Scaffold this active site. Structure first.
Site, PDB file in Angstrom:
ATOM      1  N   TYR A 158       3.000   8.643 -11.580  1.00  0.00           N
ATOM      2  CA  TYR A 158       2.045   7.954 -10.691  1.00  0.00           C
ATOM      3  C   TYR A 158       1.135   7.035 -11.511  1.00  0.00           C
ATOM      4  O   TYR A 158       1.018   5.828 -11.211  1.00  0.00           O
ATOM      5  CB  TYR A 158       1.222   9.002  -9.948  1.00  0.00           C
ATOM      6  CG  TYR A 158       0.264   8.423  -8.944  1.00  0.00           C
ATOM      7  CD1 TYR A 158      -1.031   8.076  -9.303  1.00  0.00           C
ATOM      8  CD2 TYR A 158       0.643   8.258  -7.620  1.00  0.00           C
ATOM      9  CE1 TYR A 158      -1.912   7.549  -8.374  1.00  0.00           C
ATOM     10  CE2 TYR A 158      -0.231   7.743  -6.680  1.00  0.00           C
ATOM     11  CZ  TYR A 158      -1.513   7.390  -7.059  1.00  0.00           C
ATOM     12  OH  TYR A 158      -2.370   6.889  -6.120  1.00  0.00           O
TER      13      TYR A 158
ATOM     14  N   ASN B 219       0.829  -1.226   0.000  1.00  0.00           N
ATOM     15  CA  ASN B 219       0.000   0.000   0.000  1.00  0.00           C
ATOM     16  C   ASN B 219       0.859   1.270   0.000  1.00  0.00           C
ATOM     17  O   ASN B 219       0.365   2.314  -0.444  1.00  0.00           O
ATOM     18  CB  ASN B 219      -0.992  -0.052   1.168  1.00  0.00           C
ATOM     19  CG  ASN B 219      -1.521   1.307   1.570  1.00  0.00           C
ATOM     20  OD1 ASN B 219      -2.544   1.763   1.055  1.00  0.00           O
ATOM     21  ND2 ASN B 219      -0.817   1.957   2.486  1.00  0.00           N
TER      22      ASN B 219
END
Ligand SMILES: NC(=O)c1ccc[n+]([C@@H]2O[C@H](COP(=O)([O-])OP(=O)(O)OC[C@H]3O[C@@H](n4cnc5c(N)ncnc54)[C@H](O)[C@@H]3O)[C@@H](O)[C@H]2O)c1
Ligand SMILES: NC(=O)c1ccc[n+]([C@@H]2O[C@H](COP(=O)([O-])OP(=O)(O)OC[C@H]3O[C@@H](n4cnc5c(N)ncnc54)[C@H](O)[C@@H]3O)[C@@H](O)[C@H]2O)c1
Ligand SMILES: NC(=O)c1ccc[n+]([C@@H]2O[C@H](COP(=O)([O-])OP(=O)(O)OC[C@H]3O[C@@H](n4cnc5c(N)ncnc54)[C@H](O)[C@@H]3O)[C@@H](O)[C@H]2O)c1
Ligand SMILES: NC(=O)c1ccc[n+]([C@@H]2O[C@H](COP(=O)([O-])OP(=O)(O)OC[C@H]3O[C@@H](n4cnc5c(N)ncnc54)[C@H](O)[C@@H]3O)[C@@H](O)[C@H]2O)c1
Ligand SMILES: [Zn+2]
Ligand SMILES: [Zn+2]
Ligand SMILES: [Zn+2]
Ligand SMILES: [Zn+2]
Ligand SMILES: [Zn+2]
Ligand SMILES: [Zn+2]
Ligand SMILES: [Zn+2]
Ligand SMILES: [Zn+2]
Lengths: 251, 251, 251, 251
Positions: free
Chosen positions: A157, A91
């Protein structure tokens, strides 16, 4: 009264000291998983361990950097010490520079790829081996809506989150025979304390309008799906990408 | 010890008298949903209701044909009478003729489209209106892996299942403001009693080879994902397609 | 008699000295593009330039490594010297080692990401700026079927090819106003002369069986789609992923 | 100077009397295909044939309704009379009622499915058989961006276009051995005469902002991609969905 079949095992949650990772750690622990909270920030990781234990669950903290492959190894060892490792939630992530592809700094590009993609791979290597050795488990990789669509000025990203879907597919194909499941979760924009603090009232409204539900998601709303996918109830779910995006990608 | 936030509401499960629908009905009722089991086969629907009640749950049967729009209306009324309708699982479906596109009979094509697509739409009309009026809910449409990939000699089925992803997206966009979520589930090949009874030992092995996990799914492994998506924990999940396919579509 | 609207402009083809890149360079040059053939292999790059000139076309060679950002800058300068740069095909790529995710060499992983993803980004930076400055153009990124599905033991490759779809989307969104289109092409397995030398008869037959057409693709069959997408005929095509895979991903 | 390898064969273009179909017919005929223009509107089809012949091409008009399976059979016979049928563009389509799923007319739903899905299937049966007998060919199905995303108040249309992607995949898998390729094209919003007539300036400006290029597409921009995919240059392209959407689905 939601409960998940995640008991009698340990769970690694990377970047578990804050935001979505924190929510994941709390939900997994609440259903009886022994959670190893890993994070760059030792005190943040320790705070989530303390919250877990104030609510009556089991957890431990390990501070370090997921971009160091040695740290993923140390995380798998520390988790296995609590209980057999059968859950990993990769995560930890960072947002990167806000700039066009043409203007993007090489350092920022490389940093975002290193944390958001390469560190997931680094962590997965010992996670896969540990779970294969102890009869099976689940790896949940935190992707994004931006694993399947773009968003101007966040190219590194978007690129890294796209990359995770392929890494997820491949590990799923390779370790299915060992009953190690690997899946990707794709949240829409989530109202974390950091997001709340960054967004102007106007910028927040603009993002809300891009979700059919007309709001940003809550960290708990991602954590529920992660906890389900990491559980024994999800035993036929592997290789796949699961959106929790309030309808963002449906238009 | 899996439990779902589906209590204090009614749930329609179409085709609930057999296979996946039966498993869905049992799972929802075990977490406190008042389930209306609808099916062509009255005795099968009654058998599932009897199982639910023996296990301590609440359910009722309603026999009829989902291709009659009046029956979907009657189902919504009967469900609302048990408790406010906040879950519908449009699961009734048929496999269709086995033939190439060129050879496919027109009536056979039309029948698969009528049950596997148009009847989902017919049921959704009163479902959407009921859930919008009582403050929100969840509709889960039973698609397939064959909603995203093809399979030789099942074109009508593949076509209908692909169609469901668009109907799901559109209803999700249109009723998000009313807090009615609409999602699609895509199972791989599932070992329902009729799948088991059809497949030769050889043909079973062939299909197992097409799933990374090296086996077909179980009905309860679909039912778990349906129950999760129909529950309050899935409050930020709408418009999306969720595979439960043992890695089938990952290669 | 196929002809493409690619005249009166220069085109960079990275890895243009052999295989698919060579086929792309020849097709673009035969329709009037001035092709800069870039490759690690200077002899191969010069050989393709000689082929192009022998057929009456315009081309020049530049030998170097796309993983050096300075080389991509030098490629754009050298292309602009021939004619205004309005096409770039980021085709250079490597396979990486054959190994499971758990066993995968850290260095092999990083090298595959560096060539197959980061070098495409490095090249795109000056490509995008040059094309925006001269009123628009087209960037074609060479992805793969393995940008959307997995393949056991090639995780790094699959990951990098997935990443390209996101980089492609983002650049498309950011430079659309400047009329710079950015697209990804996804070939199935292609029987380049190098592949024909490498594959055993059994390995070739296995791969043929994974394509509906029952054969591997020809390099010319990829080059045609690349030339079309790089042309003025493709003026409304941007952000998108275009498979040339003989049906591989349709099942 | 764009030219396509579509000579020495016939091509059916359904709905060829107007808009995108008209552009497809003109582009195919200009590259030497003998085009059968089929349409409900005989005079509109005849007008397109007149334009084609004035420009030096070969074409004929056939008026009828693609929802009558006998008409698709008659169309294949009429095309084969010109030259061997090796191209079919299933382009005829209608928009439907503008209404929510809950309010949607059963009559409008069924009509949209009948033309936009069932009639594509009806025409494909004789198309596939003729092309298989002729040694191969290409079928291009006119889908939409709305074959992969939703658009509020056009559920029937969105559903039908999603369905086409499955029909395309299945026919591609089944007829690949006969060298009959089947693909789907997905245009963004296109400025056909009836779009320009029906949209208010404000509605048009709103749609322009949803395409990255900041404009709607032109019919010729769809026709070029269709012509390419229908041609011998696209000989390894089958089963796949090809967007011509100005970046609409990239965000
Ligand atoms: N809107 C959103 O917040 C959103 C939406 C979709 C996906 N995601 C993804 O969810 C994940 C969590 O995001 P978040 O919003 O909760 O972020 P956050 O910044 O609130 O939390 C991320 C945590 O990861 C840790 N971390 C960062 N780099 C690390 C490293 N190298 N080693 C160890 N720990 C590291 C940080 O210390 C932090 O505690 C990320 O992968 C993000 O990309 C977020
Ligand atoms: N391998 C699989 O079994 C599999 C895989 C993916 C998706 N699905 C989907 O799961 C759903 C359920 O299938 P299943 O395998 O459990 O089949 P099943 O035959 O065991 O159950 C289907 C049920 O639907 C009912 N039904 C059929 N037509 C109906 C109609 N017109 N009106 C009312 N009820 C009707 C039948 O009577 C039956 O009880 C279907 O939509 C199917 O396409 C199945
Ligand atoms: N089956 C296939 O061949 C296939 C299928 C799909 C996609 N692709 C992709 O197509 C592209 C071309 O593949 P190919 O089969 O023609 O490969 P190839 O190995 O035959 O040719 C690649 C060329 O790129 C050059 N190259 C490699 N690294 C370089 C670098 N760092 N700098 C400059 N030049 C470099 C090589 O010298 C060579 O001439 C690759 O991106 C590959 O991933 C190939
Ligand atoms: N924005 C757009 O225009 C757009 C975008 C994406 C996809 N499409 C698709 O492109 C295709 C062509 O649409 P268009 O915009 O050019 O529309 P149009 O109305 O300009 O042309 C459609 C043609 O189809 C014919 N037609 C309709 N129903 C028929 C039937 N039953 N039998 C025979 N002919 C019939 C009409 O007579 C007409 O000439 C459709 O499938 C549409 O869904 C259009
Ligand atoms: Zn009966
Ligand atoms: Zn019975
Ligand atoms: Zn050869
Ligand atoms: Zn596949
Ligand atoms: Zn007339
Ligand atoms: Zn007229
Ligand atoms: Zn106009
Ligand atoms: Zn979108």
């Amino acid at each position: 009264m939601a409960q998940y079949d995640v008991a009698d095992r340990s769970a690694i949650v990377t970047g578990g000291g804050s935001g979505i990772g924190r929510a994941v750690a709390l939900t997994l622990a609440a259903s009886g998983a022994a959670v190893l909270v890993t994070d760059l920030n030792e005190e943040h990781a320790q705070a989530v361990v303390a919250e877990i234990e104030a609510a009556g669950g089991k957890a431990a903290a390990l501070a370090g950097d997921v971009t160091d492959p040695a740290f993923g190894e140390a995380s798998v060892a520390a988790a296995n010490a609590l209980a057999p490792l059968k859950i990993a939630v990769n995560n930890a992530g960072i947002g990167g520079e806000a700039a066009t592809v043409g203007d993007y700094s090489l350092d920022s590009w490389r940093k975002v790829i290193e944390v958001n993609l390469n560190a997931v791979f680094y962590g997965m290597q010992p996670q896969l081996k540990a779970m294969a050795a102890n009869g099976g488990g689940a790896i949940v990789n935190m992707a994004s809506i931006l694993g399947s669509v773009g968003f101007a000025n966040s190219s590194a990203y978007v690129t890294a989150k796209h990359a995770l879907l392929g890494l997820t597919q491949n590990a799923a194909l390779e370790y299915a025979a060992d009953k190690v499941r690997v899946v990707a979760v794709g949240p829409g924009f989530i109202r974390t304390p950091l997001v709340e603090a960054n967004l102007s009232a106007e910028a927040l409204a603009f993002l809300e309008g891009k979700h059919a539900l007309g709001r940003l998601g809550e960290p708990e709303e991602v954590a529920s799906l992660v906890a389900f996918l990491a559980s024994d109830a999800a035993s036929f779910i592997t290789g796949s990408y699961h959106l929790v995006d309030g309808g963002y990608t449906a238009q």
